[PDB]
Amino acid sequence: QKKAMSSRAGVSQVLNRYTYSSTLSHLRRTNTPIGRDGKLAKPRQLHNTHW
Amino acid sequence: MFFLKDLSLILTLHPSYFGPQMNQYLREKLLTDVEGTCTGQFGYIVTVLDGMNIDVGKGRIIPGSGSAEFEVKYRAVVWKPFKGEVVDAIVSNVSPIGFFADVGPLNVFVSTRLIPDNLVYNPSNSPPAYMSNDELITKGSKVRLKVVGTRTDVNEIYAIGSIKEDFLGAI
Amino acid sequence: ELAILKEERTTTPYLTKYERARILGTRALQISMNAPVLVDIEGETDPLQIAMKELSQRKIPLVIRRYLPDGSYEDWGCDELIVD
Amino acid sequence: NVIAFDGSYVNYRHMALLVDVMTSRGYLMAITRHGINRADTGALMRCSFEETVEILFEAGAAAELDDCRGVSENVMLGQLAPMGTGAFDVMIDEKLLTSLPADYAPT
Amino acid sequence: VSTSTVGARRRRAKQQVDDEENATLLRLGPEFALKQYDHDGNEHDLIALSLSESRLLIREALKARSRARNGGVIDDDELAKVTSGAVANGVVKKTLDYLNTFARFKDEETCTAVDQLLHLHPFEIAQLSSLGCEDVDEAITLIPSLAAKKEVNLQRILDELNRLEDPY
Amino acid sequence: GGLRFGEMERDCMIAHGAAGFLKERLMEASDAFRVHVCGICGLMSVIANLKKNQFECRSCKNKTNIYQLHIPYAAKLLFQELMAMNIAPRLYTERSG
Amino acid sequence: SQFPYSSAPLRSVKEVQFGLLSPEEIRAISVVKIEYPEIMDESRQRPREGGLNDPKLGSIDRNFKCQTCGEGMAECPGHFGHMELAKPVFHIGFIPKIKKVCECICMNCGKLLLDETNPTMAQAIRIRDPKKRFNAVWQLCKTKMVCEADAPVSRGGCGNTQPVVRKDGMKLWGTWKKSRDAQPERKLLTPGEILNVFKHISPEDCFRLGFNEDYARPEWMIITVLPVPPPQVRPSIAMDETTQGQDDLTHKLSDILKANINVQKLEMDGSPQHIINEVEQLLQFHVATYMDNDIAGQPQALQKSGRPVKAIRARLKGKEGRLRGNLMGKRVDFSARTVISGDPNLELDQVGVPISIAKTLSYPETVTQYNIHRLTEYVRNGPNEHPGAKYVIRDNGDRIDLRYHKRAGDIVLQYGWKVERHLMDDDPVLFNRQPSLHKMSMMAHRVKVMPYSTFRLNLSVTSPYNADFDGDEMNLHVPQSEETRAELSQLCAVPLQIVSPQSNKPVMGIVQDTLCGVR
Amino acid sequence: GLDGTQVERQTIDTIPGSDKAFHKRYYVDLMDEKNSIKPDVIEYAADILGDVELQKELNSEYEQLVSDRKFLREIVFVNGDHNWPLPVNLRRIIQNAQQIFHLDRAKASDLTIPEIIHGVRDLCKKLFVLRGENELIKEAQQNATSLFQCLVRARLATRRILEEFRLNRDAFEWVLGTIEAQFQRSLVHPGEMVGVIAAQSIGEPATQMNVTLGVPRLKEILNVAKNIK
RNA sequence: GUUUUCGUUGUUUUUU
Ligand SMILES: [Mg+2]
Ligand SMILES: [Zn+2]
Ligand SMILES: [Zn+2]
């Protein structure tokens, strides 16, 4: 908490039980924590390797 | 000294008060607001010369509850005392702290230290006044005094007299 | 230096839609403030229709101070500024 | 040509006004932050764009004066704008009020 | 409440002593300066009136207003009763009494004659006419503002004014 | 919650000639306070009391040349931080010319 | 109108004059001397008089009145104080300008390296703009190797060589090149020296250095006293419902003032040289954080929790700061936002308004001779249904909470009173969608009070909005004066936005079911 | 000085057309009946046949149209296009007159050519945009009304009047009055926020989307890149 | 007793 700056936010989040899948799929996310520092489409665009 | 001033006023008229003679209504409203009021910038408001021919300009409409501004402009004679005013006056009351001189809307106050040494109080003689060799300061008498005090007091500016210089007193 | 003479007025001899809205709102608000009525009323309980009827025959005691860019202005009586 | 690129149409006069304003001062004026801020009108606009503090430092250092003639001055002071309905001053007059019947006389 | 035709006069730093009114030093304040403009900016001088001329003007204005009110039809009190307000009535009666008790010239003819005669600063001549004097030494004792001009030209003025004085 | 009136809505209203409408949206539907400012210094530096009817500009000793202003409270905030940053934004009810 | 009576005439601001604030005028506005960092006088209400939360500076609650003006939040306009700095400091946005003014005049005689003698400087001073004339003054000062004691014929100059001025840390340092190069005596430019040289500056000099004598001063550019805001500006802000966390401004003011008192203590005590330096720099970056905690290259003042401390500079620049988020954008009343639905049987210039919206939203109709009957019907009808008054406004300003009023229907209307008539059918209302690109996205529709909680619209009017009924939220605004209703009806109506000025074409047409049908 | 709701695409008839076709559409021929006005449509063909005042009037109008042809085809509209947003829908006005006053059949004309010519010359002056008395005021008036006058001439020349739709007294007078009224209603309203109007009218198009066009070229324009990509 | 009293920082996810 002392080093509040330069800290990643969102790696842990409240589990959703709105629906059953709101948990299941919720338990199988992935994230790329690069940030909008430079917008780009490569972090957002689907790639053939994602097949 | 009587001074003629281009006295003016701003009127905020209630929206229901529109009509043909509206401007003339303004007149009386000005007449009921200009008089009976003093200010440091002008002084005692006493009269408005040519009050039947006052120009207000083309009246403007307030964008709102419906009121109207009126820049009522005119010419008036309003009296105002000045410091160093060495003018004959009539005394109104006599007090040990200093005799009162009702000179216009104000009342002249004479300080304890601005009374001549030959002026001594003799309350027994009627009316209460000041007597000396060829000197008689009574009601309705012409006594030359100098207004030396001028301070703005929003409602009336006071005048303080001085009888402590050469050729001052009763003519 | 302020008022452009009525003949010197070089701008439109017609009322403008902005002037339309201003005059209508002002007159209807006035009569809503129990100001004198310059027209007749049949069923126009809301003052806006009364102001509209006033504008129809242009019996409105207002005057438009159309400001010129240089700083001067043109004064146009309602009844002399043509309906538009 | 850019407007015609997609095939859509835009009125001539408005973007003509655009290009003339681009050129009415003899050179090319940009919509860049400093380019618009290089203007020397009431700071109340250029500062409100961005970097407000720097523009205020420049203006106070010059002790500038704002005439409250921009519409932004009107909106952030909450009064009638000098546009359209506010491009004039509609006034209660006297020449037409005289035509009223005498019963309408204010008391 | 009441505005004025004189504007501007914002917060400035170049200050001057001309802020306290003073008659003997010829001070009239920033409001009553040498170069003033009316509502329309017309060039005009400050109005100064002697007490007797002021009395005639106020009397004639009051009688004209009374006759206009009558619309077809001379005392100070009846004229003072023109306006509204008990305090207004009191102050107008008091100022009319001040005018009556301190009008060195009584009727229209002598006040008019001295009006053409007295008319170089208008205010100094106005206060010379207003301040009743008898001879030169009294005038110089009572007026410290006219000490030296290399041409007093005042003995004739006082002689004629005393010739126009009200006898009793 | 109230409807946050976006700036593009302001711009479209301006193009619509909605002066009074937008004004009351910013005057009656939004912040609106009246204050008493000086005519000499042209600041809000006036001890004000309506019931006492006293308005003294401690900055300029001004009492008679004091004017009432019915303007948005956000304008008051703006004037406040302008003062707080040692900047003097002298409001003037007149025209210097 | 609705405000309590005030003899002050109704006027608006016509001009705004900028510039700096003199310390003398700072006291001329300072309603009370502030020297105590400590705010709550005895931790038992009534905060410290003469402190940062001085009640004399203003009142903060409902019942209390500002001791200065005599009124509370109802009329309390906020009042300012002054805190005398123990030592003159720099203004965060003027250090470049400190370098500028130090590149133009003498370090001892305090006057311009030239005068209008040379044609370049004279023509530079003929420029009306202050900043431009002063920067040209710089541009011609750099054409001279030394602070000329004579013509490059003494100009009253000191003659010492102009130091090389550099923004060295928070303050500046001047490399004096005294009698090929002498010992470089770059030193802390103490603000006292700068005050001296500024006072040496003649009014003609400051004028030609681009300044106004009656207004913003290089002397004023040096801070000698700081302003203490009214408590209204940084009030007790609720950290938890009732428990108030002290305002960030209050925190920083306390820090600055405690540092200032430390500086005040630096003299009477034993101060072995560098202690004064450290305490003065401490106070200095505290003051800087008062203007700007975001000093570049510095770890910003930060809360013990870890978050950085804010400044006034932050809340004035950005995307939704003071100007952006409170002045050019701010919330309004008599406004509603709800779902949109299709109403094929509805007219184009009407929106199907829920009874909730048409009821909660209302227009103040003044009681007139023609609407007296219907307005009285509305008042007697009730505040919890339609049509009906929920507040009746007296012509003087008094209001009645009809719902809480046990005699709701017993309000006899006076000609001049105002009745908050509930929004009827055919009421013109501003109509707003986000985003709103074209001016045709603002359209004035007539309220049609009809059930369901959506906005019922025509199909054709949806196409210019380029919106659908997949859950879009739409905005309605109710006029509150006759001027506004007239303006809506004559300059913002649905029929008035049919034609796009863009492609000088209509914005609307027959679509969907109707188009397939007409085919 | 017109608002963006009162102009409409109008085709100036003079600008296109073979000079021979243009002649046999615009020029008259009284002496030779082969290309003359047919006597059926007019009550004054005998007066028309052999007259010179009418011939010289129609001539002056013809060279006026030729001058307009130069003005448009060489200066204003140069290469391929002759349809432009101009005010006052002349076409609908003409059709309205025809259907109000029953301009069908081949009845002879009680209205003479000088009436048309005087009316046109009057109305050319009656167009008011910039008011005032200074010479630059009327110069700007001419500048504003040049295209409209040229188009009206391209539509309302006496020859076309008679050979096609033979406007009668009432028809012609109401046509002139309606043209003047619509033109005077076609003026810009002072006070419009034309800057913001332009801003929206340009931005909204950009809110929908190898040569540099569209948003790229827009941005090169708006940032004022010193050289485009 | 007419009247009558809640807020923010930060965090995540969202909505045509
Ligand atoms: Mg949506
Ligand atoms: Zn002041
Ligand atoms: Zn207060």
Ligand SMILES: [Zn+2]
């Ligand atoms: Zn020196």
